[model samples]
Target: QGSMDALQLANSAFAVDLFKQLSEKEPLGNVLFSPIALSTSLSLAQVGAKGDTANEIGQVLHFENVKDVPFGFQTVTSDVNKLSSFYSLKLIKRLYVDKSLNLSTEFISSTKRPYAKELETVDFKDKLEETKGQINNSIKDLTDGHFENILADNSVNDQTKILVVNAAYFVGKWMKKFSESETKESPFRVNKTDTKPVQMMNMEATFSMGNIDSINSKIIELPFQNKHLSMFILLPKDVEDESTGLEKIEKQLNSESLSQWTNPSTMANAKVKLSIPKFKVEKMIDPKASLENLGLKHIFSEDTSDFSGMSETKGVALSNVIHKVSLEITEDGGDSIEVPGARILQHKDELNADHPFIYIIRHNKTRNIIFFGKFSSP
Candidate 1:
């Protein structure tokens, strides 16, 4: 449990920083990515990293110390894999190397032991197209066909010796499902003057709600069927006040603030009317530049990197870090309601996400965010 807490804190901190950087890169649009996937993928690379390369990666990942990082991740992955019966959550990490490349015994053993990653050799030099298809097909299968062709044409070539891929897919039904009949076409405010039509899901139920006066945002927790996972929606008080909206929340985000916002003990239980836009988002990010900005430069530099632990061959640096994430939030379920009797309360509140807001799906027990994204527009 101690290791879990450390790793969860590390992953949450990394999630906020990565989201801030990506939001700065593209401010006026939708941004979505899995921090768990990114952290795990980079940790896989870190298994073979040495010298300044490993130290920098560890720092950027917010590891308390170099030695404790792997054990922390191992604990996290083990806990997450146990919730398969509750929801549809899948995380797959693979290492594809050139058929002729020689990999170190220690690197392969560590990757398999802690990370559960498999090493497969592909003919990247001769059969680039075939290799691309094989990789894409595997992703498609792993994601239940939600994503295909994650790697574009010409993204890989003969010179590429090793490619690391990480993909995560999730779909969870609400415990107290919202009726489709209650859903209506509503206006989603993109900004002060702009509006778009979206199918807004409406429901009135008892929920854990919090008011963060520091950032002037309201947060509500919507649980999944199993109650082990939940989606938290954070909305600004004034939709027109774009200045103090997500930007303010992003600046104030930390492990303590996040805990305060989502903790059940701190939040009040109220019978609330919730309005949220049904959205599906697909995002593909080349995280090399964003990661470089975060002080992980040595891993990507051929001259500075020392991955001798990974392979006996020299010049083995990270060629590219590819991440793809997709999410679908709707009012889809059967007629049965699964809420417990203890959740019903007397007080009344209202939360309408008719404007731009931020949402996160996380593991309830560990408080690790599986997906984080902002819906600025339709």
Candidate 2:
């Protein structure tokens, strides 16, 4: 009931659901994955899927709610690419299929819009190493050396026909980039009594903020250079109990609640003392294992899967979903807007994200959650 379209709503909901699922997989370690990259690659593949295979993917990716699935994905791709100049977004989505198989015309044409230049055929049987070189080479050149080794030595084999591999690299300047000289070694609270040393960046500026009474967390929006995109940090209020403040937020995270939590109008601008850790997290997630719990069963199961819409080949199922994403948080922003005369010195708030919290990088125009992660220390 807000600023996003149907597809935006679908993506937002899908992103939150996947984030919660991955958090469960490894509660103590850090979790980072690109919702946009994964959704786009999988949504495009669902175009070729049929019957139980297609239905399960649609239900899992919220593509059923989207009126035009192909067009929606194409639109988001075009929309995000438009921001590449300022946000520096690089998304490499490719489907490296075997050369022996012949695909359906309808399936190919349907996916043509979203994946116009992404579909490619290669000889995976004899030219196994050669195929890996081509796939990895394309991502290497496109991502400008940010990602390497996209295909592992064991990933490409004779039986592997279809590989949906996606990688994303983004670096945006902060509207008010933190100075390196001001960064200090601070104690990050891992638990109520445990602490770890982390390089915490500090900045005093005016930004938008809101408080959630139910979960007892404070949400802040630190806009990038363009202001069209932002990084939303949901930090739980410092509590004096044995229980974690992040528990309630994680237990009740969803699209609807996230929308309410980060609604632009509800959060007003105020002077804030921001202290966040300059942390870099890289993760490679196999959506096959994670989606198994999220009702994406038919595609991964070889026996019961049906892909008549995809190819003439009889026994072709989505073998693996490999997604790798790397994100670094630092004082990489510069001040843009003029400081208003609102007696900012009188009333001020502090957002010290020292403990485990949820952070998301999203495009405000399309309302797409680009990357979703939880910075947790076990």
Candidate 3:
């Protein structure tokens, strides 16, 4: 009931990958991988459930009621464990973040041991709740922790169990930082057929600019940090050509193309004049919805999984997955007169975008995209 179908789980994972790819397609693009941590979280859920089954050797225990665990770990099913020579599954918790939003998830097995200590019914429930609380608190503590470091450890213990609590968070600043002073009531052309005086922030900067004759479009790169990491911002010359713009860039932009294009040898240095509207948008995605599209139904079915690694006789399936995301625009920059404080003055011989465009953020060290976003309309 509280479980997702197989297709859905796979889709969720694939979607994350697709979004990451899109985000990194801009001139200034970035991408980050939390693969190990994410993989481990899912493994823990699988293994934990196996350790909680009873009755038949291949029988597993299904959670009478499902509860929140962490991001990327949705769908709880009940099944028996087939392998028993390996490790025992106890508990799991994890967290995931993208700039500002946060998500958490947890899974616990239900199995009674013959020689293990026993507790009153009330006492057992109380202990489970306590453990769950500790897991939540631990996730909060890791809000700013590095994703890379979380995957390189082999250590294990009671305290470290908090690492299993699953969740994800995302937060980002506008690619075009707007200045409060420069933001004024201006006329904005929504579509060729429509026009209105909308409050648009006027951002002018000498961003990394490029012109694609093959596609008849211009690309703008905005650097988030002083380093090479930047957002590849793109705009199409013709609104009707938006599809072409996306297709051309998607086919042409990659690790190899990125390196060649950004290199100083291929093209002469030029200054660019840029103007971007100040806007903000946010979205919250349900892991269940995402998973149903991925094709991993056995993992969510109450009768198909083999999670003996979680426990000797019992295995618990996943329950709930939730995510919260948000973004905002602000005004404040340092400078004299000109457009706004954050606006960059284009130098002579610079490449400029007087048309529509797209953008992406890239991590210079790994040449991966951390984020990608876009805007249309002049």
Candidate 4:
């Protein structure tokens, strides 16, 4: 139990770090990613990694540089795998290596036990196209078609040795569901200068709410129907239409700050009036480039990268790692009757995320950030 807590702590660090890496590349676009899936695959490869190669993954992922790091990964993958039994949730991690290589039995067994599934060796030399089709089909089927052809345009040739693919998907609904009829065309303050119309969703409920005074933001927890997971939105308070509210929060966002901000115990329950947009954000990240940009370069090179523990063959190295994660917030939750009245004056906590903000789908039990991203302008 104690070790599981530490695993969540480390995963949070990795999650915040990875998000910043991807956000730095393209700040304007809607950013979305699943660190659990990404980390799972890297940890799978780390099973075969020797010396500095393993340390590289360890350092980047904020995995404790200790003996229990491997066990921690196993617990996470095992727990995340079990969530598949829940309705409308799909998370999958797969590793594909070149067929010519003779993988170590130790490596195969260690990976299957640590990770959810078995491994496959594809013909990266002559049958590149067919290998891609098989992988694509696997991803599509495994993730329940939430991801389609994510690897459609990827380039891999004969020299490609090892590759990791991770796909995650979930359709969101609140435990306190909103009615589709209450949705209306509302103007969102994009910035001090720009205002755009968006289909804003309205609902009223008693949910956990808090304030992160450090970054000047408000936090709200909208739990899904299952009660095991939630979407925590950090919307910057409307301070005279400041354009950088989201940016200010992002600049200070890290494991410690995020943990402090989203602590459910500190948050108070209140009857609230919420107005959030009905939207979706799905983005693909070129993880090879992003990882290299983060100064973890030794893993990509055929000569420098070490995978001696993985196989008897000596020439293979990591080709690339790709990730495309998604989330769509719809008007689906508990059934509610739409009532419009201006008769009584009742003060309520109003959280209208009518501007750019960041949110995370948090797995309550694991405390893992299932999906993290921001909704930009319309």
Candidate 5:
């Protein structure tokens, strides 16, 4: 548990940097954190034995971690019965761990624990569905995404235990959309000093916005369907554009400051023009590097990472941790009457970013970030 707290802190720190980078690249974008579902699936396997069973486990756990080795030190015993129970229990435990460590409150309950009968009745597809549900239940209050699980041909060895999971998430736009008539194709300062042709969405709304002197940037909050979970944008005041400010944002981002917000009431209504690019991208990362970076050095050790939950004295090191992500953009326009005038007015184009941007997944109440990534062109 001690190591886990540290791991959570590290993960949170990583999320801050990831979000900061995303904020810079796409000032008017939304970030939904769903990949944590993948983390839950993989971490469960880290506690499993190695070899074909480990290989089978690897199919479910895909992100790369620096500390985990390419080849496992030894072969893992393949016990289907034991593995089935282990996978089920491990998934539950990881879900609980995630809530306790990241979320401010525990969402998982002890009353409805997964039964052996429950585990036995589910086939691989059902198992995947179950894992996805467990992951979703852990953070259902905040974010959503789509996910799938793949098992190797020889996933189940008579002696081998394999864990299976699949999940998907979809986060609706945080702020109510704007009318497209308001959107205008204008020159945008991609860099503070350099201007580029872009579609800028103009809106006049009251929301939380602030500046961080330490990082020399401004922070803006865009609340979502779940008020607790919102998209944050950080922009540099002095740089020619956001891209150049990214490096500084990454280094200065911290959990304490991340949770801080400008006085909400002080955020006055002002005329503002925002431009954002819509984009989708995918990537794979090792879980070990991520874990070690988060100060969880013991989990991968042969003697440590007390994973008695999987098997008795079985040396199981997390072999792999993999992750993938994607986002799409759409634009819409409409006309509405102005606050004081009966005449119809063109609303600023809803800056539907349809090209490229960065994002991060975080716990709503706790402000803990679970995953961070970026995408451009693709």
Candidate 6:
């Protein structure tokens, strides 16, 4: 349990750092990503890294102690895999190498032991198209066809040697399912000057809600079925603020503040009148630049990177690290309720996320963030 707690802490720390960097890169639009998938992919790369390469990866991933890093990944993956029935969550990691290269025995053994899968080797030199198709087909199969053509044309060429691919897909139903009839078209505040029409979901139920003065934001927790997973939404008090509430919260975001805001102890149970827009987001990030900005620079440079532990052959460096994520939040297959003859008058706490806010889908058992993204428009 202590190890798991430490693992969650490390994962959350990395998640916030990566989010900050991505937001800096793409400031004005919606942001969607899976921190768990990115970290897990990097951890896989870490297994094969040596010397300064491993040290940098470990530092950026918040590996306070190197010995526990592998255990943390295995434990989180094991726990999340156990909750397959509770939600539709899939995490896929693959390492594609050139057919001429030979992987080290130690690296292969370690990967299979924790990841439960063997590294797949393909001929990127001669059959670039074939290799792309194979990788894309596998990703499509793993995501249940929700994602296709993840690897763009010419993404793989003769010079490409090693590619690390990671993908995550999640489709979960709300525990307090929203009635489709209650969903109405509402205006979602994109910015102070712009608004877009969206199908906003409405529900009134008891939830964990709180207001944190440190960041000056209101937070609400909505649990999914089986209580194994939940989504936490953070809304700034002054929605019309120029910087936007999300920017303010991001500046103050850290593992400690994240824990405090999402912690059940700090929240109060109250009846909430919640209105959130239904959205489906598909985002793909190369992550090489972002990872470099976070100080994992050597991995991308062939001369500086020391992946000798991965392959006996030299000149094998990380060509590209691609991460694709697909998420859908809707009223599909939700429970239906009969409307009463008349409306009942009752006072309830209101939380209308009509403006930009942060949303996180977290695994309750492991406290690992499966998906973290922000909704600004739809």
User: Judged by TM-score, which candidate is best?
Assistant: 2
lDDT (tens digit, per residue) of candidate 4 on 1-378: 677677778778888888888777666556888887777678778789776787888888767543565576677666656766764778777778887777888887776655656367888888888887888888889888888785855456666788787778788766778878899998887776677889999977677798777887889999887677889999988634355347777788888988999889998766678999988767777778778766577788777788889876765578877777778888887654333441243335879999888888888887888888877676
Candidate 3, 25-76: lDDT as tens digits: 4322222322222333444444343422221111111212222322213222
Candidate order (TM-score)? 2, 6, 1, 4, 5, 3
Clashes of each: 0, 5, 99, 2, 47, 0
Off by over 4 Å in 1: 66-68, 240-244, 334-345
lDDT at 176 for candidate 4? 76
lDDT of 5 at 14: 48
Prediction 2 global C-alpha lDDT: 0.80
Candidate 4 has what TM-score?
A: 0.92
The global C-alpha lDDT for each of the candidates, from Candidate 1 onward, is 0.78, 0.80, 0.36, 0.77, 0.38, 0.79
Candidate 2 per-residue C-alpha lDDT over 180-229 given as tens digits, one digit per residue, 9 for 90 to 100: 99999988887687788999999878888989988888999998886878
Question: How well is each residue in 108-188 modelled by candidate 5, as lDDT tens digits?
Answer: 221123222111111223244454455445423222223332223343322222233322233324344554677677654
The segments of candidate 3 whose C-alpha lies over 4 angstroms from its true place after superposition are 1-17, 20-179, 187-192, 195-199, 213-215, 241-269, 305-315, 329-358, 373-378
TM-score of each: 0.92, 0.94, 0.47, 0.92, 0.51, 0.93
Sort by lDDT, best first: what order?
A: 2, 6, 1, 4, 5, 3
Q: Tens digits of per-residue lDDT for model 1 on 235-314? A: 98775455425777777877667767767677877778888888778788888888889999888887788887777677
Query: At residue 359, what lDDT does model 4 achieve?
Result: 86
Cα lDDT tens digits, model 6, 1-378, are 776577778888899888888887767677888888778778888888888888898889987664566677787777776765456877777767787777777777777767655257898888987778888898898777877877876566788888888877888787778878989998888777678899998887677788888788889888887678889998877664574447778888887788888887678766678888888898889888888899988888988888878876776789987788888898753453423421244335779998899888888888888888887776
The lDDT, on a scale of 0 to 1, for candidate 3 is 0.36
| Model 4 stretches with alpha carbons more than 4 Å out | 65-71, 239-244, 335-347
TM-score of candidate 6 against the unseen true structure: 0.93
Clashing pairs in 2: 174-332, 174-333, 175-334, 177-333, 177-334
Query: How many clashing pairs in candidate 5?
Result: 47
